[PDB]
Amino acid sequence: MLIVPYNLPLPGGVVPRMLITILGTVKPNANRIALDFQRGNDVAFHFNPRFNENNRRVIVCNTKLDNNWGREERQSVFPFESGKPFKIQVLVEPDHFKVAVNDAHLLQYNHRVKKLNEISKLGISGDIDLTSASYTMI
């Protein structure tokens, strides 16, 4: 049980083989979830399930640099369901963040922010009950 929005420090930033695991349950009538891997004020990797964008469900991924959002990458495969427990695993690989939900590969996001060791915080927000947020090296 954790308070949302939740900040998970990532000491010394991220590095390949680092696995971040988030467990929670989507609230009924959820509108959004967001993971924000941050480098100071910049967002290296924004992972944003949207439950009702023009009556469609979509995951939007992007990067924010100097307060400007870049080119969105959109995934219509949408494994989250209102009211249900989920597990998000984010594995840092040399060229991308690799995301699996409920043990199924979902998407990859190529590193736009190159200074991995400066991506030192993960913000977790949105319409969830957050159970746990942790990391380990695999």
Ligand X SMILES: OC[C@H]1O[C@@H](O[C@@H]2[C@H](O)[C@@H](O)[C@H](O)O[C@@H]2CO)[C@H](O)[C@@H](O)[C@H]1O
Residues of each annotated binding site for a beta-D-galactoside: 69-75
Q: Decide: is 113 part of the binding site for ligand X (CB under 6 A).
A: no
User: What's the min distance (Å) between Cβ of 72 and ligand X?
Assistant: 5
CB 20 within 8 A of CB 89: yes
Closest CB to ligand X among residues 8, 65: 65
CB of 19 to ligand X, least distance (A): 24
- Let me know how long the chain is: 138
Q: Indicate the residue among 62 and 131 with the shorter CB distance to ligand X.
A: 62
With CA atoms as reference, report the closest residue to 15 among 135, 130, 138, 116: 116
Distance CA 57, CA 32 (A): 10
Cα(10)–Cα(32) distance, integer angstroms: 23
Residue 48, interface with ligand X (CB under 6 A)? Answer: yes
Using CB under 6 A, pick the residue from 24, 35, 46, 90 that binds ligand X: 46
d(CA 104, CA 136): 19
Q: For residue 33, what are its two tokens? A: 């979830």
Q: Does 60 bind ligand X (CB under 6 A)?
A: yes
Cα(41)–Cα(73) distance, rounded to whole angstroms?
A: 21
Would you say 18 or 90 has its CB closer to ligand X?
90
Ranges within 64-83 binding ligand X (CB under 6 A): 69, 72
DSSP 26: E
- The size of the interface with ligand X (CB under 6 A), counted in residues, is 6
Q: Please report, as ranges, the residues that interact with ligand X according to CB under 6 A.
A: 46, 48, 60, 62, 69, 72
